[PDB]
C-alpha cells in the first residue's frame, strides 16, 4: 500500500511537469542492446514481420525442429514476479505453423492477442486461427490441427476456446485465446477499467500460472501493445507481493523487461497508460 501511495505521487509529478515523453525517451536510450544474429540470418528474412523488430539471441524461443529453429519470439522471465511470457510478432502467412508449434512445445495454456488482423486498412497479422467450428486448420509443415471449439464475443474483447492437436501423436490440448479487439496500434485501451477486466479474465483462467508453460502474448510486432500488457500485469503483481515498506518502480521493471526483447512499449502514452492501469488496478484489489 505504501507502494500505491508513492506511485500515485510519482505519477502526479510526471504528469504536472509534462515529463512523459522525456522519461520514455530516457528508457529507450538506456534499454539493453543485445545481438540478434539468428534473426538476421538471410534464410530467416521471410520469418520476420518488421526489419526493426527482432528477438535477441539470448532470449529467443527455439522451435524443436532440426532444419530451422527460428521464430520471431522472445521469453520474458520476471524472476521476482514469478511470471514468464512469450512475446512474439503476429504470425505471417508462412509462420502460422511455427507459431502453433511453439505454443505446443512451450506448453502454453493461453494466447493473448492485442490486435485486429486488419487495422486501418492494413494487414497486421495472419488469420492464424479458424473462424468456424466445422472448418479446422491443418498446418502441414508442423503437423498440427487447430479447431475452433467455442467463441464468446464481447464489446471490448473476444474469448475463444481452441483445440490444438499434434497429428503425429493425436494428442489434443485446449488453448484459450484472449483477443482484445479495441486496442488501436500505437494507442491505448479505451479505459483502464476495460483493460483491467481483460487482464483479470486472463488471470482467472490460470493461463499465467506456473503450472503451465508461459502465456503467448502478441500484437502486430509483439512489442508495443504486448509490452504494455505484460508490464501492467507484472507491476500489478509486484504491488501485491511486496510488503511495506516498499515501492514498485515501473520504469525499472520495463527496463528489466527490455533485457529480454527490444522495444517493449512503443509510445510515451502507452507508458503513461501502464501507470494508470497499475494504479487503478491496485486500488481495486
Ligand atoms: O502492434 C503493436 O502494438 C506494435 O508494437 N506494432 C509495431 S512496432 C513497430 C512497428 C509496428 C506496427 O504494428 O506497424 C512498425 C515499425 N517498427 C516498429
Ligand atoms: Cl481481427
Ligand atoms: Cl523503442
Longest Cα–Cα distance in the chain? 60
- Asked if 145 and 138 touch (Cβ cutoff 8 Å), the reply is yes
| Domain-wise residue ranges, the chain | 1-285
* Cα–Cα distance for residue pair 177/162, rounded to 1 Å: 7
Give the side-chain half-sphere CA count within 13 A for 49.
23
Q: What separation in Å is there between the alpha carbon of 223 and the centre of ligand 3?
A: 9
- Experimental technique of record: X-ray
Please tell me the distance from the alpha carbon of residue 257 to that of residue 223, in angstroms, as a whole number: 11
Pick the catalytic residue from 125, 219, 230, 235.
Answer: 219
User: Cα(262)–Cα(222) distance, rounded to whole angstroms?
Assistant: 10
Backbone φ and ψ for 48, nearest 5 degrees, come out as -110, 130
| Angle formed by the axes of helices 224-241 and 268-284, nearest 10° | 30
Yes or no: say if 281 and 232 are a contact pair by the CB < 8 Å rule: yes
Is 219 annotated in the active site? yes
State the virtual CA torsion across 90, 142, 133, 112 in degrees, nearest 10: -30
- CA-CA distance, 248 to 2, in Å (whole number)? 10
Find out whether the beta carbon of 53 lies less than 6 Å from any atom of ligand 1: yes
Q: What phi, psi does 234 have (nearest 5°)?
A: -65, -45
CA-closest residue to ligand 1 atom 11? 221
In the reported structure, the alpha carbon of residue 253 is separated from the centroid of ligand 3 by a whole-number distance in angstroms of: 15
- Number of Cβ within 10 Å of residue 69's Cβ equals 13
Compute φ and ψ for 191, nearest 5 degrees: -160, 155
Give all strands of the β-sheet with 215-218 in edge-to-edge order: 60-62, 70-78, 83-88, 215-218, 110-113, 171-180, 157-166, 144-153, 137-139
DSSP string of the chain? Answer: -HHHHHHHHHHHHHHHHT-HHHHHHHHHHHS-----TTTTSGGGGGG-S-TT----GGGEEEPS-SS--EEEEEEEEETTTTEEEEEEPPPPTTTHHHHHHHHHHTTBSEEEE-S-SEETTEE-S---S-SSTTS-EEETTTTEEEEEEEEEE-SSEEEEEEEEEETTTTEEEEEEEEEE-S--TTS--S-HHHHHHHHHHHHHTTTTSTTSBPEEEESSSSSHHHHHHHHHHHHHHHHHHSPSS----HHHHHHHHTTTSTT-S-SHHHHHHHHHHHHHHHHH-
Peptide bond between residue 248 and the one before it cis (omega within 30 degrees of 0)? no
Q: Give the resolution value in Å.
A: 1.9
CATH code: domain 1-285 is: 3.90.190.10
Spacing, Cα 80 to ligand 3 middle (Å): 24
User: 23 burial class (0-12, 13-18, 19+ CB within 10 angstroms)?
Assistant: middle
CA–CA–CA angle 1, 84, 179 (5° rounding): 90
Q: Cell numbers 493425436 label which residue? A: 170
Residue 101 near residue 212 (C-beta atoms within 8 A): no
Q: If you write DSSP's letter for every residue of 150-193 in order, what string do you get?
A: EEEE-SSEEEEEEEEEETTTTEEEEEEEEEE-S--TTS--S-HH
Amino acid at each position: 500500500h505504501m507502494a500505491s501511495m508513492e506511485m500515485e505521487k510519482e505519477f502526479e509529478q510526471i504528469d504536472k511537469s509534462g515529463s512523459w515523453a522525456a522519461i520514455y525517451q530516457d528508457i529507450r536510450h538506456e534499454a539493453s542492446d543485445f545481438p540478434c544474429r539468428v534473426a538476421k540470418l538471410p534464410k530467416n528474412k521471410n520469418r520476420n514481420r518488421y526489419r526493426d523488430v527482432s528477438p535477441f539471441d539470448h532470449s529467443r524461443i527455439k522451435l524443436h525442429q532440426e532444419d530451422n529453429d527460428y521464430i520471431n519470439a522472445s521469453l520474458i522471465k520476471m524472476e521476482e514476479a514469478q511470471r514468464s511470457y512469450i512475446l512474439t510478432q503476429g504470425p505471417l502467412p508462412n509462420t502460422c505453423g511455427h507459431f502453433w508449434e511453439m505454443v505446443w512445445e512451450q506448453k502454453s495454456r493461453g494466447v493473448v492477442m492485442l490486435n485486429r488482423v486488419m487495422e486501418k486498412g492494413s494487414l497486421k497479422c495472419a488469420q492464424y486461427w479458424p473462424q468456424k467450428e466445422e472448418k479446422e486448420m491443418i498446418f502441414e509443415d508442423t503437423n498440427l490441427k487447430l479447431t475452433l471449439i467455442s467463441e464468446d464475443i464481447k464489446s471490448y474483447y473476444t474469448v475463444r476456446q481452441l483445440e490444438l492437436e499434434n497429428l503425429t501423436t493425436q494428442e489434443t490440448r485446449e488453448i484459450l485465446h484472449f483477443h482484445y479487439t479495441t486496442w488501436p496500434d500505437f494507442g491505448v485501451p479505451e479505459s483502464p477499467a476495460s483493460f483491467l477486466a481483460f487482464l483479470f479474465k486472463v488471470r482467472e483462467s490460470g493461463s499465467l500460472s506456473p503450472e503451465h508453460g508461459p502465456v503467448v502474448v502478441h500484437c502486430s510486432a509483439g512489442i508495443g501493445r504486448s509490452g504494455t500488457f505484460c508490464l501492467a500485469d507484472t507491476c500489478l503483481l509486484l504491488m501485491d507481493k511486496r510488503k511495506d515498506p516498499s515501492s514498485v518502480d515501473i520504469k525499472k521493471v520495463l527496463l528489466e523487461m527490455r533485457k529480454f526483447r527490444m522495444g517493449l512499449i512503443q509510445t510515451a502514452d502507452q507508458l503513461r497508460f501502464s501507470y494508470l492501469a497499475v494504479i487503478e488496478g491496485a486500488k481495486f484489489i
